[PDB]
Symmetry: D2
Subunit: 462 residues, 4 copies
């Protein structure tokens, strides 16, 4: 009532968004357990959180948990295609500043992040950051250093964002401490892997409605996202080949039942067309990049792909695929939003019945969020319970108020303790109806642990 | 065979030719190990090493033994389990003039005698200076009964989770006398051997022991670590309906996401020692229970009383105390079907009716079932484990801890893992063995993610 | 051109883009276009068609037209139309009456608009049907039109069941081809199509994680087999119910636990017969039977809170949705997704936790909440349809003397040789390479080198 | 003083008996028939010549026939498939059996002849149980006067049925037969899931090879090829499938397999030039499943990747051209039923040669040659059908019919669906499965009786 501090696609989608939020709450027991456990204590009272992460229904439940624990927030999406417009509407209709819609331009994307940083044309009195991929973190460091003086910490969601934080820490340019939320086991080995198992084939079906069984796929990378992606396709009956630069991850792909190949003859990427294994790429119906690296589906690979192959990226940024080359050289025919046929016949127009085209999903942006709805609530429950715990921890540490000498001892990128990781996992397991066994005192003593945990040394890899 | 060689004890020396044929096949299945043989043979990095070895005397261990010897070592060998020796592998090693004391079906007394035969040569302590162990039994005997021998030993290379646990306990209590390498926690060990090894060999052992159809039946896997993960997959891929029990909620979370129902043998998960705490309805529908924990009494007497008639019971953890077989020896009548396959008749202790329907089938008397009823992990998986063992032996032997002054010794008394660069090099040879082709990063790409083109490719915190 | 009714004609260009993609996914259908274009074997055929107005059906429609036919089309379900497909067909000048979200009355009206042209019966001479609704209406309300119709080609198990019942009772007026029972239909479409599209529909409707949750699939025929795999491959813990012990044996061997909603399998009508403990652990129930009331009122009362309920058999009476309309309050989440509040009939608490989620109001969930089977699977079914249309149209049943009609009034399947030819085109579409028998090998197993390769008894 | 048998070692009898008692608890359909029909003795007076793999599972079948009143004389239908402890247990029970693991071809024929003849003259046989048609063929060729008094043949397997239908078509079949193979509780149980269980079993026992990550080529995708492909894919193999039947090939594609041919463009012109050498040079394991001849031929064998495993799970060993390998290459026995075939020539071999293939069971049925064949709970279905088929044909008494009636009943037929469903129900109950009973309204709705049959005869499952 008099609330205008937002920008969304269509505020009238709010009722729909709220209905899906209420369903999502029943799917996110770890997050709702934190809401119930901490609402009375208000651990985030006084926290003012700049948040930049995909404005989905799942993020909505995270935002309202932070608010329920006392926080104020100003929110944007971390991708131009990942917002669910009904989720953004519901958050805006609840009186929460949010600047996010599906299908932003790059200019609008930056404008949305700035609308969270600035309130009434001046820096918001922010003191906490929640980021997914590091874009908000980067803009604060380059453009708003005086704001970082008063920020107690950053809680970063994803592998690519953690890499950018560690880069800054090594260079001595990180200004506030951070929690690497990504490397909780209930994040990395849940969200990154099983989330992509759920949502990769989901997005490919919604975009193309292609049968996947019996066709050939090439997954580039076999980390947590590549593992999940490869399973998303293999469980549908695809014949999946895996590329990797890490021989340990390649070994896992072999033992998991995949053939390990390289787009390049003998794996040597020398920049020439002659290095492309044209015979291999000429049989591939679907290529998925999962690396967080640059140009792993390059222009020569795109030229060699089988006609009518699907091309998509599920890593954080779109530069995994050389989409710039395709914009320069080939004609783009939009099938529907976030589905384009790329005609390799040339740049100036195309025959509507041309058979030499590729299908690109979400213009090379994160395909699970761009062409579907990303990971499901019950998986994001784990990631976002860690986010809430990470926000509570850094806000209580009050880094910004410490003397310079004490700041120097606390400026780091850390993970949550294993005990908290286990407590998140336990709520997830109970959500499935699973029953964890309790060690007897004898058994606890025998393996050298407390009955309540933690159950594994910090070196353990699961 | 060296003239007059008698410094060994095996079941049947006439099996040596068969063993040698299978060793030649296994060399072709173990490219990381044979690649170390080719790379290091000329340089002889283990010349002067005298290795006491205690690990399952299989064909795969045979290839490991002859690699150590090819690099210059002398060895004296025993198995780390009474049922895990393949007698044709022991025979081939003995016929090569290598002291080995190992046969399938040892008694517990013979098991200790075999280890002592490695430790003693001609009635006196051998001048050993290295130890390779799997489970910590050889390490324990040296520390407890031959402590002076450890004054000359440069290090221990320990194969398995349970053995490392024991070493870390000694380190924490100040009782470990020599440095050790935790071979288990190489990724090309723990996340290869422990998981995929059990995936290959668990259903293999159950089939050899019982020839039971597995599809459509109910299994309960106790544990979901690396061995529990592989064991659950071994059974699920055969079409079993697999339930998983865990005390670790993170491992239980993985089990749920992997498609398993997570249950406890006890109502509400609370194990209070009473029959009343047993979920009798659950245990009464289980056809197969497998323990994978490395913990004690995780398949207890009341569980055994409540199990479905004719359920199979087995253990793939390192030691047999995962199952309360002592209870079964005390109370129930054992009928041997064939070696390492026993019907345990719950009707009472003395006799049994030949056609009684109320029995359980116990495999390998509760000892490691994959080695006891089949042949353990396959050569191509053991390749990674044993490449790491060889690298760990070279590293500790070269450090010469026993030759250091006491000040320098205190700095190096530790339990370490091999560096990630070596882990990656093992994996690369494994991938090539499959015909896999690893892509090489461009310089720009290596710069982009902050690694060298040659690796390592992951920070040490990475969990794979 | 105004002889159509679709939701939004401006969707035509989008639909045409997707038809052009679909053509590249349907090599068996497109091969028929190339093979028979010169003969025009359907020249003079006027086909009443009643089947889900999807992109895939669009390619079928345009294949029939390319071979000479005229058609007038409706959907066979109120929720299965893809509006852009309907628009693309309408924009090409083809009469079609179909949109997503019809009422039952509009559904009936649409079929009647195919039957009637300018207020009078169209001079139809062929029928293509999926489920038997158009066949039933013609027999009961327009029996005179069947005097000019040469045959029916029926798509699906439930439609074939209805044809055989009419044949047994002597009420079927024209011959028919059972398209369902070609192997490239029944063992492709019914099984693998549901494998692809069941989890697809559940994800689009609810975006629920499926891994780790408990499913109960009622039935294990072809649709039940594909449905169970759709869920198991996502990591659901799937239990299977069956009345047929052979199908139940297949479920056991395929790795599923076989259970009944009723204690000891005995459905005596009482709440006491419900296995409440089992139903109280089920997160998702899917009915696949073609039977009536296999998810009944007492089962719905006993289901775990917030379980998903859906049906992928042809008709919605597999679930007792009528009970739920009478007794419980429905909250629309979005089209084809309703929360059903077991707290009462009049109103509901917006935060109530005691509800079920029903998809597509109990109608075919794969078509109602997603897009049904993928083009490359429907290629097989619809190539059989085209061949079956050609065969019955060439037989010219309606022109035969009454004495010769009696000898041809039957329900038949296509011959195996054609089944194999459709399959080969599908295999080639994957890049598969079939081996050719040597003369000696062909003699050894007693087949011709070109096939057929199996006796008619073979079950694959 | 029972001496009417020949087995490897009678002292294995106690061990065989122990495994028989276990197997009875895994075979509820078959033991259900034992309990249901024991008092009635429906096979009293039956005298059955039996020729099928002398396994523990066959032991339970034999003792079921005996318990129902039959006498029998038994042999194995393959030289490597006998389990010596099962043969010993049967002989120790006083049942004539002539079978051991590792027969020569000459001994194989002698064993069958020992069942046909008793004390040097034709036994008074009146029933035949066969697996593959070898006993059936010898009777028709060499003992026609015995067939005059025989009421029928019950034939287990696809290849045996093919030989029966050829005889029927040529007018040479002398007695009616039941095609046991094509019961759904046989063909879609035994042929498929039995090979799923036992193919990777036999490969592990023979070689202990890791299968995960390696390349397999399965020739054929019928029931045996389907189950074999699953046996390897579930272990993590990368499985390619070859087929001549496009419908079976379509199934392989949709099941998630790549469909390939050993020959370029699928055309076998008999020369090396037609072999896809790039494909075969990548294959770690080839398995033949066809029932056809020379589907893994000499030119394929020459092109296979070094150290590939070659095996056959169809009924006869001519699926692989082992004759070519015997004529040209040197064989090194690793252990029984496992040979290295050195492609360096025929005159000796280097013990460390790298260019060899591994042949399992000398090309004979690999699941039975290198392991124990199908598990008891699967053979339960097959052998319940066998017992019922024996009962049906013995009760018909074809040999006593007048010539005019014989002509009307000389056929090869399958058991009715009601029997197939009742076998399946006992298998399901063995897993603890609970089948739902239709209500009268539901049975009416789909047009079936509450007790079944639930499907028309056309249904393919
Ligand atoms: N879309 C989603 O929902 C989602 C979820 C989590 C993470 N992510 C993003 O996905 C990316 C990967 O995340 P992760 O956790 O899997 O990282 P990771 O480090 O676990 O895996 C990346 C893998 O790519 C491999 N790789 C690098 N360059 C390669 C090349 N040229 N060819 C082949 N393989 C190559 C690396 O060896 C590594 O194993 C990141 O950008 C992350 O932020 C996306
Ligand atoms: N047989 C083989 O070939 C083989 C191979 C490798 C290791 N091992 C042995 O197997 C054992 C397990 O090794 P690992 O690497 O999997 O160790 P691990 O630590 O990875 O896993 C053991 C798991 O057991 C769980 N657990 C403990 N007590 C439990 C209880 N009471 N109920 C349920 N779950 C319980 C723990 O939470 C843990 O996740 C060790 O003894 C190891 O030495 C055997
Ligand atoms: N949605 C789709 O895309 C699609 C595709 C093909 C067919 N269908 C429809 O799906 C239905 C099933 O087709 P089908 O080809 O699988 O038929 P089917 O005869 O192969 O299978 C139906 C199965 O249900 C079982 N069944 C019957 N009543 C039961 C009960 N009370 N409890 C448990 N099981 C019971 C039967 O035993 C049978 O095995 C039909 O209505 C058919 O028209 C839908
Ligand atoms: N080992 C066992 O336990 C066991 C069990 C059952 C049957 N069998 C035997 O296995 C064989 C197969 O039986 P089935 O029931 O699977 O028969 P089937 O007719 O169902 O399948 C055989 C398949 O081989 C294919 N084929 C034929 N020639 C081919 C070629 N040159 N290349 C590729 N594919 C080719 C056919 O198209 C067919 O689909 C028979 O000999 C049968 O008696 C063995
Ligand atoms: N649904 C989702 N919401 C927010 N962040 C995500 N990352 C992946 N899936 C997501
Ligand atoms: N996509 C589709 N089109 C037409 N009929 C169908 N039946 C199932 N899926 C279908
Ligand atoms: K979602
Ligand atoms: K082994
Ligand atoms: K579709
Ligand atoms: K067996």
């Amino acid at each position: 009532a008099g609330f205008t501090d937002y920008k969304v696609a269509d505020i009238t989608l709010a009722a729909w968004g709220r209905r899906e939020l209420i369903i999502a709450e029943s799917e996110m027991p770890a997050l709702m357990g934190l809401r119930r456990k901490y609402a009375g204590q208000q651990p985030l009272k006084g926290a003012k959180i700049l948040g930049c992460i995909h404005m989905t229904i799942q993020t909505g439940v995270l935002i309202e948990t932070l608010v329920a624990l006392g926080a104020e927030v100003r929110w944007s999406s971390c991708n131009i295609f990942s917002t669910q417009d009904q989720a953004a509407a519901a958050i805006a209709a609840a009186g929460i500043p949010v600047f996010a819609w599906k299908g932003e331009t790059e200019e609008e994307y930056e404008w949305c992040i700035e609308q969270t940083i600035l309130k009434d044309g001046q820096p918001w009195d922010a003191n906490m950051v929640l980021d997914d991929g590091g874009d908000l973190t980067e803009i604060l460091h380059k453009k708003y250093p005086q704001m970082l003086e008063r920020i107690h910490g950053i809680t970063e969601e994803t592998t690519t964002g953690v890499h950018r934080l560690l880069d800054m820490l090594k260079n001595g340019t990180l200004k506030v401490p951070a929690i690497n939320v990504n490397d909780s086991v209930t994040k990395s080995k849940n969200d990154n892997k099983y989330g992509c198992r759920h949502s990769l084939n989901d997005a490919i079906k919604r975009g193309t409605d292609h049968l996947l069984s019996g066709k050939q796929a090439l997954v580039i990378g076999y980390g947590d996202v590549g593992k999940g992606s490869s399973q998303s396709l293999r469980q549908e009956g695809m014949i999946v080949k895996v590329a990797e630069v890490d021989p340990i991850c390649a070994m896992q792909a072999c033992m998991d039942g995949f053939e390990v190949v390289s787009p390049y003859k003998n794996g040597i990427n020398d920049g020439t067309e002659a290095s492309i294994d044209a015979a291999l790429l000429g049989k591939i119906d679907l290529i998925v990049t999962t690396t967080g690296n640059v140009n792993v589906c390059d222009a020569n690979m795109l030229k060699a792909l089988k006609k009518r192959a699907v091309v998509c990226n599920i890593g954080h940024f779109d530069n995994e695929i050389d989409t710039a080359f395709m914009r320069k050289n080939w004609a783009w025919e939009e099938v529907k939003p976030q589905v384009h046929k790329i005609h390799r016949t040339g740049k100036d127009g195309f025959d509507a019945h041309n058979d030499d085209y590729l299908i690109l999903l979400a213009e090379g942006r994160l395909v699970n969020l761009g062409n579907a709805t990303g990971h499901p609530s019950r998986i994001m429950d784990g990631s976002f319970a860690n986010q809430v715990l990470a926000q509570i921890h850094l806000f209580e540490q009050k880094y910004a108020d410490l003397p310079a000498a004490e700041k120097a001892k606390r400026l780091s990128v850390e993970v949550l303790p294993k005990k908290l990781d286990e407590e998140v996992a336990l709520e997830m397991v109970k959500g499935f109806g699973g029953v964890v066994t309790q060690l007897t005192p004898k058994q606890a003593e025998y393996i050298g642990v407390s009955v309540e945990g933690p159950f594994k040394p910090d070196t353990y890899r699961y």
